Design a protein around this ligand. Sequence first.
Ligand SMILES: CCCC[N+](CCCC)(CCCC)CCCC
Ligand SMILES: [K+]
Ligand SMILES: [K+]
Ligand SMILES: [K+]
Ligand SMILES: [K+]
Lengths: 103, 103, 103, 103, 106, 106
Amino acid sequence: SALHWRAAGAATVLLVIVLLAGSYLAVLAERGAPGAQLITYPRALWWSVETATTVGYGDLYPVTLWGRCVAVVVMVAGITSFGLVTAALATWFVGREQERRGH
Amino acid sequence: SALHWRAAGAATVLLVIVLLAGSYLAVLAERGAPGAQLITYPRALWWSVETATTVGYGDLYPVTLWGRCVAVVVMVAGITSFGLVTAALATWFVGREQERRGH
Amino acid sequence: SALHWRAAGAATVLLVIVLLAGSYLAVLAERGAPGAQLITYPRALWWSVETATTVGYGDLYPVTLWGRCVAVVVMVAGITSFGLVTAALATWFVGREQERRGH
Amino acid sequence: SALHWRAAGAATVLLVIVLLAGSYLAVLAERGAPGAQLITYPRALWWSVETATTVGYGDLYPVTLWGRCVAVVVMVAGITSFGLVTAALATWFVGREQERRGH
Amino acid sequence: DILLTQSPAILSVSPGERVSFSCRASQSIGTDIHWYQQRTNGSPRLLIKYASESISGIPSRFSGSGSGTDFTLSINSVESEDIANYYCQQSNRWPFTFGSGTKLEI
Amino acid sequence: DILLTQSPAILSVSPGERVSFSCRASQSIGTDIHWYQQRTNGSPRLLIKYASESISGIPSRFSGSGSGTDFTLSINSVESEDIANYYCQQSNRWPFTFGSGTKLEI
Ligand SMILES: CCCC[N+](CCCC)(CCCC)CCCC
Ligand SMILES: [K+]
Ligand SMILES: [K+]
Ligand SMILES: [K+]
Ligand SMILES: [K+]
């Protein structure tokens, strides 16, 4: 099937994997750091979703070096992905435009 | 008319619908959660706008599971959309470039 | 000159105008609202820059309806613009690719 | 090699340079400002990563004019870059689409 | 849950004088405070909304100020009809709460 | 580290009466507070989770409320089997901590 669609397709599944392992590792990295709040899987997961989507209200955030590293990876995967959907959405348009142009 | 324009076009209307139902459901999800602030339609709506546009100052945010779910959907619709305008803006350029290239 | 470049070009100037009038109007909208902090031009301007670029640390944010409206406009201009640079950056690549493809 | 790939390629290295000099200058700009927290290289660096990726939890942020300036530059480099990867990702798709279209 | 402290419980004042009842929040609630007046055997009557916004049908005599944790309901020249209980109520955070109430006395 | 103050240490009450033990946090912990009951020579037994969520197998007599810094464990009609130590414990911030404990007395 259409590459750009397999991509966006893949892109999503992969993200969901990063979101999960992110939540899991984040808790692991944070526990042990006094005053840390990123310390229970459930919220850790919502932490990752708000982070990938780049929103991040600051209700929760990593304070350990490894915690942050995970953050950087979640952040980057989050960005990259959506941008890939965009890119893919563009191929779609650019292509269907040619058609309407009789080419 | 030009697909990529109908898209961006649609994309906007749809968002406005998500923004509204988002505000409405958010209040519904949050009320009942002690210490929750996402609890009156008006601000709930500004909550959704700052969230879709991915800014989110942290002045307000969901603390319930369903509240968050709505957040994830508002977040995603917000992103996707703007990225679609971008994509569409690209088809526009790529096309008008060909023309200037005499093709 | 190349449309997509005039666009990104325009896009920037325009933003700078929105950033400024944003700062100006924001102060105007906020003053009068007890507990409001978005109330002096200087920071109001940094408020707008962090907002357009969608970062927004929550160090400062509008609490009035008109203040927020300005926020929504700054937010939207900020997004749209950068996305336009992206779009334009894509036309550039897509075009120079054809060339390397001898077409 | 493929321009759009050299670009994304470059784009990354450059960012890493901005992230670093950003952290370095930020500390330099902030120290001296009472109540400032952006004052030690290590966190200053995580400050820059959350800022470039536009997340920014508000755990840390510049309060000086020069500090902010650096912020604006980190913000802008951060955005621009990722958007360039996106753009480049689009050329990739648009091109491989033609191929699948036998052209 | 937020605590709305209203002291004193009673307030003595003379005709036409200016009176001010105090309401304190156990934590910042911004402007999300609202005033209600209840006369002997009456139902509550919204007096002020969001701490300083007036409601239609309410004497221009009634005013309010404040933000964060300290709010003030003020009557600029009291008078018989003003004899009642005054309560504050916040809607900044769930669940809404009410102030212990303050009785006006001319 | 968070401090969970539990006072009084002991609480006297009469059969069927309604009792309420207080637990205060040295800072906002939201709803991340949980109740445990420990009878003489027993192991702790989760009574409530997240301050107001009930656990299965626990008398509907047991309830809880509160958020931020002030939380309350409540028994609606005490009775012999209720004689024990009650502790609160927060999991808002690492490391978890426990309340000094409060002894019920009928
Ligand atoms: C001016 C917008 C900058 C923010 N974006 C776009 C959001 C559109 C609501 C966040 C992407 C979401 C993962 C792009 C990343 C820039 C580093
Ligand atoms: K963002
Ligand atoms: K953000
Ligand atoms: K924030
Ligand atoms: K933010």
